[PDB]
């Protein structure tokens, strides 16, 4: 007897692949993963909405998901890989400022969102622990990107087709071993929400 | 900037707490901060409804806080101190029965838990990984406990203090190294749940 089978969809089976990649990306020490873990996340909902599999189940599924992938595992990153006193208080208010912001979406039913989001918070943090070489610098990011994400910044969703591609395919590059694309696109997402922001 | 100030309680520090310490249990690789995580989720709560400061966002940020400590630390702290490609196999399969049951948990206006409550299930596993010094049974344990936080077998919430300050104290003897406490009441909770899954329904 286990009617949680009752409950589990074509979506779901997605979502659970991006907690295993997001759980690995911990347990192997991956950047890589993390990238992978960002199509997934990006994926699983445009999948829900396809296949008309979405449900609350999946959309709680779909925050636990980010926690694993997005929250600790860019925190644990961050540490593993620059062991420092001033690193682990940035790993901590990093995977403070991601459980706060996704404890606002879980609230929330607006199609943009409040503050920066949580995987381009990883994106950002994850390609910069891998382009930058600093226990410091790598330190101040991560609170930087931690307040943007439980400001007040709208950032727009736009799942449309071609805009979730033309990331992911920056992903794909980014796996492999070439960020550069997945983080010059995650920057210029970031400011942008600043400037729309700040204008108005 | 920040009207997340507005809509943050006094419970959700507490919260606020539970997510430090399960987090830094990951970072330090700590047996020890995990019981301090039940006893941090077993009162943000009680906060919560004593002082009048129950929320969807505290609610989120419970539900957020269980994943950190009782879902990837656990399977973290396994495979960490028992390297293999099984403790690997299992510890996603650990963490994997942990998010599926929580997001249950947030559908669910019930009264009880349906399924073993992941904070029961990370302190058997924890406790475990305390006492036993084998990647084998360690595995299958989190088998165990996997399927068990799934499964439909009811269990009840009594969350008045008397019942809280039982297992806090024996969740005390476990952050200072004597987990047996905490374990026997765990493992007697656990098959309690199964005798009465078998025994009556309604
Ligand atoms: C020329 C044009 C070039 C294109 C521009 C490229 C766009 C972005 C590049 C980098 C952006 C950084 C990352 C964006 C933030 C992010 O992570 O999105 C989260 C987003 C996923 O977040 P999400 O909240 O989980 O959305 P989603 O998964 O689809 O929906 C979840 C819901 O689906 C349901 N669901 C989900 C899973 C499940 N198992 N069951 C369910 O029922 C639940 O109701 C859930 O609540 O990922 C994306 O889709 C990325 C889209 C691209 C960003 C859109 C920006 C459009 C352009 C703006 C102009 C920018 C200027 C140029 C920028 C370059
Ligand atoms: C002698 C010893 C034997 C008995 C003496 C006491 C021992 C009891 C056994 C405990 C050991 C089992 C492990 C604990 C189980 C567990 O995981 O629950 C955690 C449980 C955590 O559950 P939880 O999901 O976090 O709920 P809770 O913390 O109360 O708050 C959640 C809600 O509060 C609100 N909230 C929360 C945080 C926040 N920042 N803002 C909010 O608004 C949201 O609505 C949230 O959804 O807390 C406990 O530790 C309960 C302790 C007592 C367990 C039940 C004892 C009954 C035992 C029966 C055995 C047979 C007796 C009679 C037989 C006939
Ligand atoms: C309002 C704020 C409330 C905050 C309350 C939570 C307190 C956080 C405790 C952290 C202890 C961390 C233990 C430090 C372990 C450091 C290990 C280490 O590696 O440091 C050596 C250095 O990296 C070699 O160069
Ligand atoms: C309540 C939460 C806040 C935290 C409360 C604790 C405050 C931390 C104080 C540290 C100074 C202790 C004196 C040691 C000087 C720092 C040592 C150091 O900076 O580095 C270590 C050295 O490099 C070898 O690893
Ligand atoms: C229903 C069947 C499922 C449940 C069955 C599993 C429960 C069996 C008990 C296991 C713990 C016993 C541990 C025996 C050894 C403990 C003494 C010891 O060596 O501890 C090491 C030391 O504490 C290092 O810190
Ligand atoms: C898994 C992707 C599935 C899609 C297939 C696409 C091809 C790319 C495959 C693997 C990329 C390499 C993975 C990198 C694994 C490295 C593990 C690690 O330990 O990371 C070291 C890092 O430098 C910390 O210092
Ligand atoms: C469009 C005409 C009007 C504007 C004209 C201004 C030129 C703007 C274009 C590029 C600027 C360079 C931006 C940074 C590009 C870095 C690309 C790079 O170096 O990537 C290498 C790869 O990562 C190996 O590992
Ligand atoms: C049904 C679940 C499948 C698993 C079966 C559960 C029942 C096994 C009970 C105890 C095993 C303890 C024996 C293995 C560990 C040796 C005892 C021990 O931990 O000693 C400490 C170690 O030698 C120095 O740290
Ligand atoms: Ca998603
Ligand atoms: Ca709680
Ligand atoms: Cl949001
Ligand atoms: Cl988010
Ligand atoms: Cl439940
Ligand atoms: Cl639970
Ligand atoms: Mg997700
Ligand atoms: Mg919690
Ligand atoms: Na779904
Ligand atoms: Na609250």
């Given at each position: 007897?286990?009617?949680?089978?009752?409950?589990?969809?074509?979506?779901?089976?997605?979502?659970?692949?991006?907690?295993?990649?997001?759980?690995?990306?911990?347990?192997?020490?991956?950047?890589?993963?993390?990238?992978?873990?960002?199509?997934?996340?990006?994926?699983?909902?445009?999948?829900?909405?396809?296949?008309?599999?979405?449900?609350?189940?999946?959309?709680?599924?779909?925050?636990?998901?980010?926690?694993?992938?997005?929250?600790?595992?860019?925190?644990?990153?961050?540490?593993?890989?620059?062991?420092?006193?001033?690193?682990?208080?940035?790993?901590?208010?990093?995977?403070?400022?991601?459980?706060?912001?996704?404890?606002?979406?879980?609230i929330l039913n607006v199609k943009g969102f409040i503050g920066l989001p949580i995987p381009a918070g990883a994106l950002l943090l994850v390609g910069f622990c891998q382009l930058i070489n600093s226990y410091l610098i790598?330190?101040?990011?991560?609170?930087?990107?931690?307040?943007?994400?439980?400001?007040?910044?709208?950032?727009?969703?736009?799942?449309?087709?071609?805009?979730?591609?033309?990331?992911?395919?920056?992903?794909?590059?980014?796996?492999?071993?070439?960020?550069?694309?997945?983080?010059?696109?995650?920057?210029?997402?970031?400011?942008?929400?600043?400037?729309?922001?700040?204008?108005?």
């Amino acid at each position: 007897m286990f009617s949680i089978r009752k409950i589990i969809t074509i979506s779901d089976y997605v979502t659970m692949l991006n907690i295993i990649t997001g759980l690995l990306a911990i347990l192997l020490n991956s950047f890589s993963l993390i990238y992978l873990s960002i199509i997934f996340d990006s994926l699983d909902g445009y999948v829900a909405r396809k296949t008309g599999t979405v449900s609350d189940f999946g959309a709680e599924l779909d925050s636990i998901s980010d926690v694993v992938s997005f929250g600790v595992a860019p925190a644990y990153l961050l540490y593993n890989n620059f062991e420092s006193n001033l690193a682990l208080i940035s790993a901590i208010i990093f995977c403070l400022c991601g459980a706060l912001r996704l404890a606002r979406f879980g609230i929330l039913n607006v199609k943009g969102f409040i503050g920066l989001p949580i995987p381009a918070g990883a994106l950002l943090l994850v390609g910069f622990c891998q382009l930058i070489n600093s226990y410091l610098i790598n330190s101040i990011l991560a609170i930087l990107i931690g307040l943007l994400m439980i400001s007040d910044i709208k950032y727009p969703k736009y799942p449309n087709k071609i805009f979730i591609y033309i990331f992911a395919v920056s992903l794909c590059l980014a796996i492999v071993g070439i960020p550069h694309f997945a983080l010059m696109l995650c920057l210029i997402y970031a400011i942008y929400g600043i400037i729309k922001y700040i204008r108005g």
